[PDB]
Coordinates of C-alpha atoms and ligand atoms in Angstrom, one line a residue:
Chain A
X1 CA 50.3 127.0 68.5
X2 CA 53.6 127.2 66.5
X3 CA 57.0 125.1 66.9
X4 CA 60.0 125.7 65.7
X5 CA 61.0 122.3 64.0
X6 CA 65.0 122.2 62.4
X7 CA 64.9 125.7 60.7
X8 CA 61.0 125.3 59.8
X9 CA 57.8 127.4 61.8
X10 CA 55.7 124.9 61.9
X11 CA 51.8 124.6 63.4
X12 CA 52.0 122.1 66.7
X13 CA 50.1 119.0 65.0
X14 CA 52.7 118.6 62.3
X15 CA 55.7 117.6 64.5
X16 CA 56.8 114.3 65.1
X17 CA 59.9 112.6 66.1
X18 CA 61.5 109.4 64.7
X19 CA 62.1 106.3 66.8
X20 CA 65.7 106.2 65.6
X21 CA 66.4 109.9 66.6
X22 CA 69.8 110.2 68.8
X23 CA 68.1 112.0 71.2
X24 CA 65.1 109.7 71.7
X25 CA 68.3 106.2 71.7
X26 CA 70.6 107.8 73.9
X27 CA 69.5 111.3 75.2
X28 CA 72.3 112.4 72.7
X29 CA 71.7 116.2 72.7
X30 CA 71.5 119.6 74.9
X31 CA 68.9 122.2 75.4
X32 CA 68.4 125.2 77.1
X33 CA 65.2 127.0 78.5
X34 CA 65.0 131.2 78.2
X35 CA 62.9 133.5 79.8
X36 CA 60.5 135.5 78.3
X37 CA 59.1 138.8 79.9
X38 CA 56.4 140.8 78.6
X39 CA 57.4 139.4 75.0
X40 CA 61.4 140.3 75.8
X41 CA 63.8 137.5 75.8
X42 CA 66.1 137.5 78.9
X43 CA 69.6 136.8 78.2
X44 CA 69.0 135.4 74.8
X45 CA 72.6 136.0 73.9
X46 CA 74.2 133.8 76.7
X47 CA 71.4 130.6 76.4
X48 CA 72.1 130.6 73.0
X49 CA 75.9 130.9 73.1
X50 CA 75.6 127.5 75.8
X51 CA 73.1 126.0 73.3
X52 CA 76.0 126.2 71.0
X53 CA 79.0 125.5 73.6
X54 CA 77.0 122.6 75.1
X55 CA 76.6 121.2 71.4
X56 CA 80.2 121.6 70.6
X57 CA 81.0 119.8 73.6
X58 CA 79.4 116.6 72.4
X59 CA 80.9 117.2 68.6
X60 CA 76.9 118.1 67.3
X61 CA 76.9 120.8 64.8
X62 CA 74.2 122.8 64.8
X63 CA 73.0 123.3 60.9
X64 CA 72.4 127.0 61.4
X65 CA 74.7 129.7 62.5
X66 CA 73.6 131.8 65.8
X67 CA 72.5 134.7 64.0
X68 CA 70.0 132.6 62.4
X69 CA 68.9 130.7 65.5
X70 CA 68.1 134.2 67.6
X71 CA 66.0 135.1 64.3
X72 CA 64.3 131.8 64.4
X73 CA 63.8 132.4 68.1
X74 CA 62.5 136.2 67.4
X75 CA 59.8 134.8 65.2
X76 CA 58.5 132.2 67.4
X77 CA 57.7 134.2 70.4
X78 CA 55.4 136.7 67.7
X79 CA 53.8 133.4 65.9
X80 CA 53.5 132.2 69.2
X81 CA 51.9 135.7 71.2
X82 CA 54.1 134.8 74.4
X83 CA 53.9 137.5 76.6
X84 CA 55.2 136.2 80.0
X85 CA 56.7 132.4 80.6
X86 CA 59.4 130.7 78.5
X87 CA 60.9 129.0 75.4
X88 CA 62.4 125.1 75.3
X89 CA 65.0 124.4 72.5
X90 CA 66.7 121.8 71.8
X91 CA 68.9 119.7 69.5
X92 CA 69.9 116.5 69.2
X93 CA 72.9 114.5 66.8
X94 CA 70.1 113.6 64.6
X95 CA 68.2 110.4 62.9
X96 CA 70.4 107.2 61.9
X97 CA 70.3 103.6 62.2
X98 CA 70.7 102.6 65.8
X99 CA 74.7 102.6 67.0
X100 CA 76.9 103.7 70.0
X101 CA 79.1 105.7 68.0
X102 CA 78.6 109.0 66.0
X103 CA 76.9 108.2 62.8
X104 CA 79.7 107.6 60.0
X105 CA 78.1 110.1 57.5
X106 CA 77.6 113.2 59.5
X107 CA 73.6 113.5 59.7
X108 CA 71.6 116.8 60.4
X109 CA 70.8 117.6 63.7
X110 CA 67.3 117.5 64.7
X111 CA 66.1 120.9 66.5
X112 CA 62.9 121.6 68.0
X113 CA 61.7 124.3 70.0
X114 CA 58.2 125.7 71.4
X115 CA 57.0 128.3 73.6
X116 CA 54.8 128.4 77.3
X117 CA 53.1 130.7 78.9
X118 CA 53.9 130.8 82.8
X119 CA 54.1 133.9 85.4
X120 CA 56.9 134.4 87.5
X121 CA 57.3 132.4 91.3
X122 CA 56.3 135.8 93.4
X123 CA 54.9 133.5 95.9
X124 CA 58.1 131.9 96.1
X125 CA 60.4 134.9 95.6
X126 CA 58.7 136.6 98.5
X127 CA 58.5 133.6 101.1
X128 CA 60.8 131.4 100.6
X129 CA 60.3 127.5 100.2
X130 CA 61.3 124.1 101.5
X131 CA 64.3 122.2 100.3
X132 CA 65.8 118.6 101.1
X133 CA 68.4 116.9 100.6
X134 CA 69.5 114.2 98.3
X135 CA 72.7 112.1 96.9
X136 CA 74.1 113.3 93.8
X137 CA 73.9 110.2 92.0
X138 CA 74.6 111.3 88.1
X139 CA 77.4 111.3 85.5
X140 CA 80.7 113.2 86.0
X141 CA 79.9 116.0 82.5
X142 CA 77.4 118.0 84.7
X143 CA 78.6 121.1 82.9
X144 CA 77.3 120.3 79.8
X145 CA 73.3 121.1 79.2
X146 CA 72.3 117.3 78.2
X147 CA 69.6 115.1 77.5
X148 CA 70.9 112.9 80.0
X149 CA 68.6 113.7 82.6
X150 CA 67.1 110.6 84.5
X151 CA 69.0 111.8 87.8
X152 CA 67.5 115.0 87.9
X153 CA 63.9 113.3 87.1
X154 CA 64.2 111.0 90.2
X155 CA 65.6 113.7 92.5
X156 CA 63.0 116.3 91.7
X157 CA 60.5 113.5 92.4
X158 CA 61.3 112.6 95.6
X159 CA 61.8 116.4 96.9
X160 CA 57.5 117.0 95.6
X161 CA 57.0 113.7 97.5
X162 CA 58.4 115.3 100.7
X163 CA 56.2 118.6 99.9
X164 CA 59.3 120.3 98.8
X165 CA 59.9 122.7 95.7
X166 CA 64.0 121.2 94.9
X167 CA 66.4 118.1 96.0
X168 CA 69.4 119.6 96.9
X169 CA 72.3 117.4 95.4
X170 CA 75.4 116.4 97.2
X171 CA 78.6 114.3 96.5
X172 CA 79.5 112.8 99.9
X173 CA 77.9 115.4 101.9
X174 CA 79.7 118.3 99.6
X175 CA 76.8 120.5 98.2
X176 CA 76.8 120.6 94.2
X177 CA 73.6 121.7 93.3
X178 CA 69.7 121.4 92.2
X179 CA 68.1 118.9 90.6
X180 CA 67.4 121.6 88.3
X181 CA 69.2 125.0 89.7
X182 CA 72.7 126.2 91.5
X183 CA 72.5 126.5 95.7
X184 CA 74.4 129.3 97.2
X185 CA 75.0 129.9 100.8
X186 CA 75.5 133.0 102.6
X187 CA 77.2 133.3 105.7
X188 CA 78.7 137.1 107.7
X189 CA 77.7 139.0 104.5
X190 CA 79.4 136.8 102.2
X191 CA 78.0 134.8 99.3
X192 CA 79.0 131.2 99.0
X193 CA 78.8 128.9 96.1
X194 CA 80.0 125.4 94.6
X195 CA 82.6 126.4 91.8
X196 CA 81.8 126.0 88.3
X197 CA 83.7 122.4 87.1
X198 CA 82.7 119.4 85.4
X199 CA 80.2 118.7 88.9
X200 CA 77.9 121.6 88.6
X201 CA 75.8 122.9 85.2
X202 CA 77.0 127.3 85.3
X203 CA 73.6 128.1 85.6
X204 CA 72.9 131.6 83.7
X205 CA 71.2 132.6 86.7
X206 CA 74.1 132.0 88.5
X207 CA 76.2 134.2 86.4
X208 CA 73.7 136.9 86.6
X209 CA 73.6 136.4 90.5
X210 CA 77.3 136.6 90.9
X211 CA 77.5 139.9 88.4
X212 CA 74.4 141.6 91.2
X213 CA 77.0 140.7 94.1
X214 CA 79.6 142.1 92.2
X215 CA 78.1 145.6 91.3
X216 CA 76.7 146.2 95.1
X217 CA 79.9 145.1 96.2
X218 CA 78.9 141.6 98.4
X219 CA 82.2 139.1 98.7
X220 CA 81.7 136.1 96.7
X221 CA 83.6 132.8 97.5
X222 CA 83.4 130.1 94.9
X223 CA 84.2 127.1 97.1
X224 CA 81.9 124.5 97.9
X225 CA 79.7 123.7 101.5
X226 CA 78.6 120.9 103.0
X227 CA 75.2 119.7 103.8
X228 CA 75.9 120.3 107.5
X229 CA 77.3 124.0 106.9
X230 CA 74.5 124.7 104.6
X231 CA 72.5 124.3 107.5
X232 CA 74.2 126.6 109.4
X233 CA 73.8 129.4 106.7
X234 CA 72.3 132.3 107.6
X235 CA 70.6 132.5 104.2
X236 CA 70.4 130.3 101.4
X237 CA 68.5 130.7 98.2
X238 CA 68.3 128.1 94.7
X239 CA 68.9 129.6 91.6
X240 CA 67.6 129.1 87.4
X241 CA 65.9 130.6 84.7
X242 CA 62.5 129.8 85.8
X243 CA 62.9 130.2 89.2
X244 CA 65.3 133.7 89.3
X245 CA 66.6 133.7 93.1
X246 CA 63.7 131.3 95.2
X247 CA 64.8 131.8 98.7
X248 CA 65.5 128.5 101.0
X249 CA 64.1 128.9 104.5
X250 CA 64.0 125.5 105.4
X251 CA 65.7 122.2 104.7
X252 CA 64.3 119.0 105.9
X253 CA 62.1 120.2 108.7
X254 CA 65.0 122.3 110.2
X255 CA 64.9 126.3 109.8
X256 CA 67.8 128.5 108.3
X257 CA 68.2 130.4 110.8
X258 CA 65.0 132.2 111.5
X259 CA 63.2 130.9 108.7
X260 CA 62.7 133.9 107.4
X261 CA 64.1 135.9 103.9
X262 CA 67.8 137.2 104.7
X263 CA 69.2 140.4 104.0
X264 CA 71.8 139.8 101.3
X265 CA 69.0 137.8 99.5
X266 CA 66.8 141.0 99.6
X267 CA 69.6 142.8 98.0
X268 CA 70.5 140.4 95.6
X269 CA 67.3 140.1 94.4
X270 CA 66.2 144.0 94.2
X271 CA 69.5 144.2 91.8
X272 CA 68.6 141.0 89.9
X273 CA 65.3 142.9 89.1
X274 CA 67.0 145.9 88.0
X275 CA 68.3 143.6 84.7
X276 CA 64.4 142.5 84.1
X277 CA 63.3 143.5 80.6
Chain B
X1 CA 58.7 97.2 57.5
X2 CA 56.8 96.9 61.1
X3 CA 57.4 98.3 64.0
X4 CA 55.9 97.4 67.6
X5 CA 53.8 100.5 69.2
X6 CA 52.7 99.9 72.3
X7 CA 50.8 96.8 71.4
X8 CA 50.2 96.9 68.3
X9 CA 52.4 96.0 65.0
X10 CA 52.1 98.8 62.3
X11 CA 54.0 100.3 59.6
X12 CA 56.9 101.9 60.2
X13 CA 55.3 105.8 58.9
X14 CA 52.0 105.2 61.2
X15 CA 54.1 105.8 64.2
X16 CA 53.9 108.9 66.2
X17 CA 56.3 110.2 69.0
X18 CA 55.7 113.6 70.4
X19 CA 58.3 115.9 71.2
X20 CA 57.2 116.2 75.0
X21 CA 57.5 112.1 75.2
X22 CA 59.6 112.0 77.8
X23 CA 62.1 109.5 76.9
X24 CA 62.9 111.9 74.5
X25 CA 63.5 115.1 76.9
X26 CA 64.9 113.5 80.0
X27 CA 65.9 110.0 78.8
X28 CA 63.2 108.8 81.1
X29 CA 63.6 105.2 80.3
X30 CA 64.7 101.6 79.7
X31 CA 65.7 99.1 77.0
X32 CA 66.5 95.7 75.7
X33 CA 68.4 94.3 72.6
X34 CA 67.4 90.5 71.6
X35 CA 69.2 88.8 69.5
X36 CA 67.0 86.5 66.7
X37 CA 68.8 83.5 65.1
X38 CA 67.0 82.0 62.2
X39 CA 63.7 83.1 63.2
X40 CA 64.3 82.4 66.5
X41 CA 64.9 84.0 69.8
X42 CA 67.4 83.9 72.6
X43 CA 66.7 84.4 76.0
X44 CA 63.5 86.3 75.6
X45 CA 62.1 85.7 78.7
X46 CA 65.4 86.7 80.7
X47 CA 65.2 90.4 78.4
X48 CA 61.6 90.7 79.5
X49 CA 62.0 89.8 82.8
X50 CA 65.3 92.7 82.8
X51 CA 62.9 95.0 81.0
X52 CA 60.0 95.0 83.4
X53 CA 62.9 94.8 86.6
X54 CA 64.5 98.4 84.6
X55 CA 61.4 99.8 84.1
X56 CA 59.9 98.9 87.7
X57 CA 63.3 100.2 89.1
X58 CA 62.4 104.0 87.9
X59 CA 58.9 103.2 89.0
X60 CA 57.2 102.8 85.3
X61 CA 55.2 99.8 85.7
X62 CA 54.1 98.5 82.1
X63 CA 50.7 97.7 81.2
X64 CA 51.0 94.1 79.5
X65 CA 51.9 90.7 81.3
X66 CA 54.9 89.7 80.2
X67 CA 53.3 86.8 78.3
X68 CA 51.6 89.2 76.1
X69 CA 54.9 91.0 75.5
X70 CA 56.5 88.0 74.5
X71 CA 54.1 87.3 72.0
X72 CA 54.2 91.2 71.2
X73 CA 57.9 90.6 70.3
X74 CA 56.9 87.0 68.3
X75 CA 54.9 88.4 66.1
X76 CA 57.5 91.4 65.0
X77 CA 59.9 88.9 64.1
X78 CA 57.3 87.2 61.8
X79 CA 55.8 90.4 60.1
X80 CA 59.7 90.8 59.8
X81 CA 60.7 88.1 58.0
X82 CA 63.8 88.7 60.2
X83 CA 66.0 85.4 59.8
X84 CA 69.4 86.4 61.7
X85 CA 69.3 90.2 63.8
X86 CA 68.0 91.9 66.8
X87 CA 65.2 93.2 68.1
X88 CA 65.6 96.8 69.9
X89 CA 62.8 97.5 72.7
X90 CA 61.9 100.2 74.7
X91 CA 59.6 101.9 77.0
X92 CA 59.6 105.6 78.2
X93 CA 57.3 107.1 80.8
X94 CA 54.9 108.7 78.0
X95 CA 53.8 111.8 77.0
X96 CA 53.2 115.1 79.5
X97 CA 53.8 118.6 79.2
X98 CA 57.6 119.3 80.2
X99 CA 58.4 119.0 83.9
X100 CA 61.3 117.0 86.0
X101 CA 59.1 115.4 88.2
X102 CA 56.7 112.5 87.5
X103 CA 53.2 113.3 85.8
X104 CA 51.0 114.2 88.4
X105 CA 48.3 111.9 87.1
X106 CA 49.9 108.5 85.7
X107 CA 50.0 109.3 82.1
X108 CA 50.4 106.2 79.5
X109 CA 53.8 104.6 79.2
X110 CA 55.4 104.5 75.4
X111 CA 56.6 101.2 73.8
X112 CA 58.4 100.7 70.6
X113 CA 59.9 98.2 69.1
X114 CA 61.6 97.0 65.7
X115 CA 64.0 95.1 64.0
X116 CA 67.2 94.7 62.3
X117 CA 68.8 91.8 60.0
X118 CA 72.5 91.4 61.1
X119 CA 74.6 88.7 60.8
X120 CA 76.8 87.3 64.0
X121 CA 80.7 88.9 64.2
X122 CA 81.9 85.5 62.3
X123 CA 85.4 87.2 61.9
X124 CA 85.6 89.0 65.7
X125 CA 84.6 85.5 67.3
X126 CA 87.3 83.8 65.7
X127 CA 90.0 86.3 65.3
X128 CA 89.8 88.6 68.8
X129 CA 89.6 92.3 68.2
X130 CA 91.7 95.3 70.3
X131 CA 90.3 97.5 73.0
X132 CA 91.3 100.6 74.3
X133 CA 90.8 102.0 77.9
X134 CA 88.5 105.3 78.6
X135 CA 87.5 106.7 81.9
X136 CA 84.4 105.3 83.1
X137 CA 82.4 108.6 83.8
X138 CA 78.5 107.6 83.9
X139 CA 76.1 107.6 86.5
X140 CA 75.7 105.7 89.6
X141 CA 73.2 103.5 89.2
X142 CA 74.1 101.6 86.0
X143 CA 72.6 98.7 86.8
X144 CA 69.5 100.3 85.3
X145 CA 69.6 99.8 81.4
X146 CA 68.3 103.5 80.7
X147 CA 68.6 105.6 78.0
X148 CA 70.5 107.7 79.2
X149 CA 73.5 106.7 77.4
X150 CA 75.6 109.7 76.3
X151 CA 78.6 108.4 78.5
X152 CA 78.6 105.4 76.5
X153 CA 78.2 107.5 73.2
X154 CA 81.3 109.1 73.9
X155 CA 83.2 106.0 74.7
X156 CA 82.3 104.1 71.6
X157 CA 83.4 107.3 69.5
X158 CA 86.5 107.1 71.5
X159 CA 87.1 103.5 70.8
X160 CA 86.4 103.8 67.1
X161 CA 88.6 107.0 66.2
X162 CA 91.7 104.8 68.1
X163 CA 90.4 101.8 65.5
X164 CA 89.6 99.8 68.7
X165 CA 86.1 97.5 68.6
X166 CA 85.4 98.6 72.6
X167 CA 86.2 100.8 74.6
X168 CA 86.8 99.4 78.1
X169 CA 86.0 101.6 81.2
X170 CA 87.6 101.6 84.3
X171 CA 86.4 104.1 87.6
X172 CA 89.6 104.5 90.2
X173 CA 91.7 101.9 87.7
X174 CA 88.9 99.0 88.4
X175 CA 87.3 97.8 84.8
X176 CA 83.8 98.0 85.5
X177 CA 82.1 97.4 81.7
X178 CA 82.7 98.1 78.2
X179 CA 80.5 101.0 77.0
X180 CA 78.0 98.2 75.6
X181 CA 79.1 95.1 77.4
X182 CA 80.8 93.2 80.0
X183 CA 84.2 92.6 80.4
X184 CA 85.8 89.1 81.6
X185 CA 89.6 88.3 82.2
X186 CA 91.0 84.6 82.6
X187 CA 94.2 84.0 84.6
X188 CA 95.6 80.2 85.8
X189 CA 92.4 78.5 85.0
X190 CA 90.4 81.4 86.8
X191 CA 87.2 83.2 85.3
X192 CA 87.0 86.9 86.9
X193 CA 84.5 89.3 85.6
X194 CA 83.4 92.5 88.2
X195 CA 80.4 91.4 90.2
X196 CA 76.7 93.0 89.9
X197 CA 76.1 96.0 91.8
X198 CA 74.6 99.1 90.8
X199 CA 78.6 99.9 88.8
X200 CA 77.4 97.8 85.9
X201 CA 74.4 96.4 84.0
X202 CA 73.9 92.4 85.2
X203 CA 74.2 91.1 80.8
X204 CA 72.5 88.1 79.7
X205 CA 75.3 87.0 78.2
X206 CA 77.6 87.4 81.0
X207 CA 74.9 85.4 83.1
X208 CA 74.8 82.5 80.6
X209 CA 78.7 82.4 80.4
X210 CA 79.1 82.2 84.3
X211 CA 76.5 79.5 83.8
X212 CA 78.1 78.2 80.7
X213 CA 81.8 78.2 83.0
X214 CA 79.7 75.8 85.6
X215 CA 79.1 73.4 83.4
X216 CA 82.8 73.1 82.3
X217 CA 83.7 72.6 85.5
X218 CA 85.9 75.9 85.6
X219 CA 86.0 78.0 88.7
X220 CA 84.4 81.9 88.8
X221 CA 85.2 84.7 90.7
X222 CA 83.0 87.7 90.7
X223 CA 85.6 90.0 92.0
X224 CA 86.6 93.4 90.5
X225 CA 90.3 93.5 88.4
X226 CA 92.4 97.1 87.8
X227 CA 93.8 97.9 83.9
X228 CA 96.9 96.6 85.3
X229 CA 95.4 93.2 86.3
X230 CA 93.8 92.8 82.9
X231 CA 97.2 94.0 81.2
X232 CA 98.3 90.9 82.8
X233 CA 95.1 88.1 82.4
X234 CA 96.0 85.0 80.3
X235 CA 92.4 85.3 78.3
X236 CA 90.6 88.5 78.1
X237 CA 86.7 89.1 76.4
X238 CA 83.7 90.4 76.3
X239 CA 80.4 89.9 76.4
X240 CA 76.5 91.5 75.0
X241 CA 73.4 89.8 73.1
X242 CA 74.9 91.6 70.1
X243 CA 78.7 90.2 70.5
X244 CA 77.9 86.9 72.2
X245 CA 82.0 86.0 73.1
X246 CA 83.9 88.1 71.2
X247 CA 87.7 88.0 72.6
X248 CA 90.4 90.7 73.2
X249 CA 93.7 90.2 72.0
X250 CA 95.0 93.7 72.6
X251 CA 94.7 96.9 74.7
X252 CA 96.2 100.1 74.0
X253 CA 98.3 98.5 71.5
X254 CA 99.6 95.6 74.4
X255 CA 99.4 92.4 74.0
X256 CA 97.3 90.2 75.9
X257 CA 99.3 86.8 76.1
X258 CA 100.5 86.5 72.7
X259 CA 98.0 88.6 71.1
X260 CA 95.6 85.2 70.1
X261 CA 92.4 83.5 71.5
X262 CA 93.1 81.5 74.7
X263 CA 92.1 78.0 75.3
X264 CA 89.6 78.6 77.9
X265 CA 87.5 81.2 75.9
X266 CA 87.7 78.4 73.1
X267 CA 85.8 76.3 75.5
X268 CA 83.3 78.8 76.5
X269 CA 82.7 79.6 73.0
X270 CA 81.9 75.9 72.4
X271 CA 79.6 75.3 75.1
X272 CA 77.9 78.8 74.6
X273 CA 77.1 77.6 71.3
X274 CA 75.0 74.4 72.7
X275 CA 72.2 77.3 74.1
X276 CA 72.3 79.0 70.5
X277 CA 68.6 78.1 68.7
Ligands
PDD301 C1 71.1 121.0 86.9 C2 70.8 122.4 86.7 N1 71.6 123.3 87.2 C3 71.2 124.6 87.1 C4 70.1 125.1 86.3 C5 69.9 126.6 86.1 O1 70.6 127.1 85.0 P1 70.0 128.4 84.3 O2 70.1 129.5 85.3 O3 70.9 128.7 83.1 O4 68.6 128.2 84.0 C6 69.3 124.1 85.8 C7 67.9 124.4 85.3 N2 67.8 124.6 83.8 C8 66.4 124.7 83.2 C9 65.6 125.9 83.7 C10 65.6 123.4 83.2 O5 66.0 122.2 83.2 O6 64.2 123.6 83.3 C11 69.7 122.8 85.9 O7 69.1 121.8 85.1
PDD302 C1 76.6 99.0 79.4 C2 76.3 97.6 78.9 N1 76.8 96.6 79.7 C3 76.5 95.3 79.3 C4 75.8 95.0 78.2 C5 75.5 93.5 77.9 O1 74.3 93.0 78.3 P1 73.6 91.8 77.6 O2 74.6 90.7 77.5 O3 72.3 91.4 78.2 O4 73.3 92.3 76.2 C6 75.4 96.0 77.4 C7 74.8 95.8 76.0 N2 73.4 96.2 75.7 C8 72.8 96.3 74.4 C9 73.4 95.1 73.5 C10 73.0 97.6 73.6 O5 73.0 98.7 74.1 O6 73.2 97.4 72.3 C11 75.6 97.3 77.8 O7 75.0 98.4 77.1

């Protein structure tokens, strides 16, 4: 296939990486991961606008203007003939001599980006999956999209060691979220999630969730749960890009609730289909 | 010149990283810096042994004995030429199609390894340099020498726009580490330095200066001291492979003591000289 390699489309065997690359030293560099259904982009516009905001947050800038990175994008998908599953870009501060600080002649950044195909989790949107939880143990910039993500490796590693699809993180028994996704809680109708500071990454998904509640009218409370109130949910459900809104109907061997799909989940999701391309 | 890949010493343009290597997506592994002097290396075996310990710690278990690493790492400094420097080491978990979670069959781990002709900080030794305080916000378990090191990026940038050398963090007002070594303070004939739990990496250095305070017969205490304890500390250093004893005069723009090298670092300095090759 093709990947997209600094402002180049290039064919797969032709990229390599330098030992010396900031992102390869120090996981010095963000990415994000979009969508792609039926070869249509979902919510290009905001993944790229955090691709940008994440990069600014870390002083990296990106080579290229936005316009030209959706083009670049555009292209890839059609070299590429992605029709369902998703597209991985990144960029990193770029190729220098090994050193802490930022390199004293700004370099350029390094970007790569490729494509996959994968369906959507219907098994998983329809019944639900097993969650467990585990000690948020990582840095304090979870907002930004980084590199940096050894925490997240060892977390999601332990949860497929249990037989479960996500580690739910928590500070001191306070909920935060995924290992790779946000958690929301719902409780009497209303919908329950960890607000978006420097502890959580404001998942797109998450945004997209809260705008659904919004337009059908479901109260939304942006304070966070505990691990022993999550349990006492009536629903709960994880959210990202790749997995859309994957109920939670059990946690540790112990059943939400029923153990069965809730309500406001069902609604949340039939609205959250109704932006779909 | 050469560079070490895996276990074989080739040309720096014959090696090969892939973009889904997954030191270079996640950060997924660990480190070393040695330090050569005249051809000759320090502490190699107490690197190794760290290296294996790191790597073992996130479960990547690396394929040589550490005998043959050794002599992996003698013959780079030869092919060199490499009279005073470092070598920089590293190992990831390899090369697998994008996912959080560990390969699902074990996959082979990366090394690289290269070097780098630097003289030692004559003038920093000697002299003392100034330090600045910064928020230590890493992860938790940074006893583990990973690559994830974008806290520490940040820090050093920090340091060097103030015209500071390090960048000394503290979590709740306790000095843990600088953002690439360890931090000692000396008060009434007293050597404290914060002791090794999973708050900061366990430095050669700062193992062969306890060792090195031992044999001059001066007491150690490896309890934790706030900025406003090391404000008031009669000696103040710090320590890494890289910066051997390199002591700090000033933080913030106040004085430590008078603003020049104690008596007691002098004597460290001198019998951490004796273990030099
Ligand atoms: C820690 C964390 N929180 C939340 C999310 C969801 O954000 P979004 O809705 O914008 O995808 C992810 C997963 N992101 C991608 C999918 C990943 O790492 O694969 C994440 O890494
Ligand atoms: C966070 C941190 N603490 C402590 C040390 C000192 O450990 P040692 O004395 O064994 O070098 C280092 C330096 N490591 C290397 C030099 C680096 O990243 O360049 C470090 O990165």
């Amino acid at each position: 296939g093709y990947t997209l390699w600094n402002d180049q489309i290039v064919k797969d065997e032709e990229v390599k990486i330098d030992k010396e690359d900031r992102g390869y030293q120090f996981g010095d560099g963000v990415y994000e991961v979009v969508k792609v259904y039926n070869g249509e982009m979902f919510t290009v516009n905001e993944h790229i606008d955090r691709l940008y905001a994440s990069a600014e947050k870390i002083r990296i800038t990106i080579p290229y203007t936005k316009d030209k990175f959706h083009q670049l994008l555009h292209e890839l998908v059609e070299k590429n003939e992605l029709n369902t599953g998703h597209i991985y870009f990144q960029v990193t501060r770029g190729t220098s001599p090994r050193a802490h600080q930022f390199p004293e002649n700004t370099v350029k950044p390094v970007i790569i980006g490729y494509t996959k195909e994968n369906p959507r989790p219907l098994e998983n949107l329809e019944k639900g999956v097993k969650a467990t939880f585990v000690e948020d143990i990582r840095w304090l910039r979870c907002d930004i999209k980084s590199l940096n993500l050894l925490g997240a490796v060892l977390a999601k590693q332990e949860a497929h060691e249990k037989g479960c699809y996500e580690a739910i993180l928590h500070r001191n028994n306070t909920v935060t979220e995924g290992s790779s996704s946000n958690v929301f809680g719902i409780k009497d109708g209303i919908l329950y999630t960890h607000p978006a500071n420097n502890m959580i990454l404001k998942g797109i998904t998450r945004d997209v969730v809260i705008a659904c509640a919004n337009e059908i009218n479901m109260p939304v409370k942006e304070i966070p749960f505990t691990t022993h109130e999550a349990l006492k949910m009536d629903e709960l459900f994880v959210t990202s890009t790749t997995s859309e809104i994957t109920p939670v109907i059990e946690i540790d061997g112990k059943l939400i609730r029923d153990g069965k799909v809730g309500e406001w989940t069902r609604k949340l999701q039939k609205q959250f289909e109704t932006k779909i391309p």
